[PDB]
Design a protein around this ligand. Structure first.
Ligand SMILES: O=C(O)c1cc(O)cc(-c2ccc(C(=O)O)c(OCc3ccccc3)c2)c1
Length: 243
């Protein structure tokens, strides 16, 4: 009994006029939980959650030297203000700076990128489409369930890249921490191909356990993007994982 459905969490989506799936994995008990077993195994475009493997690959191949190397703004003014500045790996991941990671993808190239995704067993391991946007509008797909499996390898330094690469990416994933918990996670927003979805994948570190998580929800407009974290935290409080 390693997977179990719990439809009570649907109340949180409903209260917010929303549809989606939340997947939790208790590492100690080696047990999973979700409010919709079928949606949890349906594969979607990773969108900017792909910045986790993209980062690992850029670092192992030396495209990126470390988390301090500066990537200069190219001077094109884009719609997202925080993109129009210089970034390092920490801030590029935090603000989902797509044009920085498209540069990484072009430097990596099609053959290296495909070979690395096979090694990771990442999603359907399909890179068909454009070299620098296939995670936003090409052939790659991945499920919430498949995200957790990838994230667990990363937590334990099991992926087919150096341990240094995986430690740097887990540092850059840092999102929030206090005396009660640590969250390492990555947001995503898939709008180029229907259905438009928001993502949030990562884990919650406690003193004596870690809860992995992966959620996606339908997202017609950008105004509801905060619900990704809100609905996840509401599920987390219900399960007494955070206070
Ligand atoms: O990761 C997040 O949460 C996040 C948050 C955001 O505000 C925006 C995005 C994001 C990432 C990639 C694309 C793309 O497909 O290039 C994208 O669409 C273009 C676009 C949409 C809306 C306003 C300006 C521009 C949006 C992601």
């Amino acid at each position: 009994k390693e997977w179990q459905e719990n439809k009570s969490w649907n109340a949180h989506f409903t209260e917010h006029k929303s549809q989606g799936v939340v997947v939790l994995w208790n590492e100690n008990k080696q047990q999973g939980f979700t409010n919709n077993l079928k949606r949890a195994n349906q594969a979607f475009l990773p969108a900017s959650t792909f910045k986790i493997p993209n980062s690992l690959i850029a670092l192992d191949l030396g495209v990126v030297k470390d988390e301090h190397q500066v990537f200069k703004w190219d001077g094109q003014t884009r719609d997202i203000a925080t993109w129009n500045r210089d970034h390092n790996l920490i801030t590029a991941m935090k603000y989902s700076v797509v044009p920085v990671y498209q540069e990484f993808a072009r430097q990596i190239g099609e053959a290296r990128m495909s070979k690395m995704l096979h090694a990771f067993d990442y999603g359907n391991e399909d890179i068909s489409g454009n070299v620098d946007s296939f995670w936003l509008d090409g052939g790659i797909r991945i499920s919430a369930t498949e995200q957790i499996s990838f994230l667990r390898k990363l937590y334990h330094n099991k992926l087919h890249v150096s341990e240094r690469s995986q430690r740097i990416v887990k540092q850059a994933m840092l999102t929030e921490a206090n005396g009660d918990y640590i969250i390492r996670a990555k947001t995503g927003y898939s709008t180029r191909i229907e259905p438009k979805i928001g993502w949030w994948v990562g884990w919650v570190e406690l003193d004596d356990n870690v809860w992995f998580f992966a959620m996606n929800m339908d997202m017609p407009t950008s105004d509801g993007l905060g619900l990704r974290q809100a609905i996840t935290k509401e599920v987390l409080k219900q399960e007494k994982i955070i206070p």
